[PDB]
Design a protein around this ligand. Structure first.
Ligand SMILES: NC(=O)C1=CN([C@@H]2O[C@H](COP(=O)(O)OP(=O)(O)OC[C@H]3O[C@@H](n4cnc5c(N)ncnc54)[C@H](OP(=O)(O)O)[C@@H]3O)[C@@H](O)[C@H]2O)C=CC1
Ligand SMILES: COc1cc(Cc2cnc(N)nc2N)cc(OC)c1OC
Length: 157
């Protein structure tokens, strides 16, 4: 079972200067809830941004660097390694990985950030011609969570 897990804004921005462009604690809860007890696959830059492996799941980082051997983290050096990994695997980011995997995965858990941010990295265009909406849930707003956002589960038609 292979999934994409991603938050993108109205113009498919995912990233600025190796950080998330937005502060949205709710979305990272959304992320914790989905991925706890399974597997993330991420590119090296995304891991560096995060700076340590997420607790209570398997962290796998895809990189060319053969001297990568970080405690708590498993390394892979090819895309094709992903399909070996057992269980529910979430493609975690960033741009490069989403590009390489979007045609490959079963389904996508998307947070649409209902806003327009300055970005330097993007989720690739996609159509709902190709993707069925299994669920669409409004994120709830409050003092800490102030950008409107929608949780999509899409399944490849
Ligand atoms: N909104 C969201 O949900 C998310 C947003 N982001 C954002 O996206 C940005 C990061 O994305 P991006 O700039 O594309 O960098 P990535 O995090 O995708 O990392 C790219 C690196 O991953 C490794 N890699 C990727 N593909 C391969 C391959 N086929 N074989 C071997 N190694 C590979 C390489 O590492 P190396 O060069 O070491 O060989 C490459 O340089 C940041 O701004 C981040 O905040 C990230 C995740 C999620
Ligand atoms: C859990 O914390 C982070 C998570 C992510 C990846 C990510 C974040 N949100 C969503 N919806 N999908 C993802 N794949 C990316 C990050 O920085 C680039 C994080 O650091 C704050």
């Amino acid at each position: 079972t292979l999934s994409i897990l991603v938050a993108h804004d109205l113009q498919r921005v995912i990233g600025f200067e190796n950080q998330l462009p937005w502060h949205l604690p709710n979305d990272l809860k959304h992320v914790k809830k989905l991925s706890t007890g399974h597997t993330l696959v991420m590119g090296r830059k995304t891991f560096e941004s995060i700076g340590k492996p997420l607790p209570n799941r398997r962290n796998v980082v895809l990189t060319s660097d053969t001297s990568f051997n970080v405690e708590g983290v498993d390394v892979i050096h090819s895309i094709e390694d992903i399909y070996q990994l057992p269980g529910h695997v979430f493609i975690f980011g960033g741009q490069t990985l989403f590009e390489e995997m979007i045609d490959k995965v079963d389904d996508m858990y998307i947070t649409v950030i209902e806003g327009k941010f300055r970005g330097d990295t993007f989720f690739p265009p996609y159509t709902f011609e190709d993707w069925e909406v299994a669920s669409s849930v409004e994120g709830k707003l409050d003092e800490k969570n102030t950008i409107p956002h929608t949780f999509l589960h899409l399944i490849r038609k």
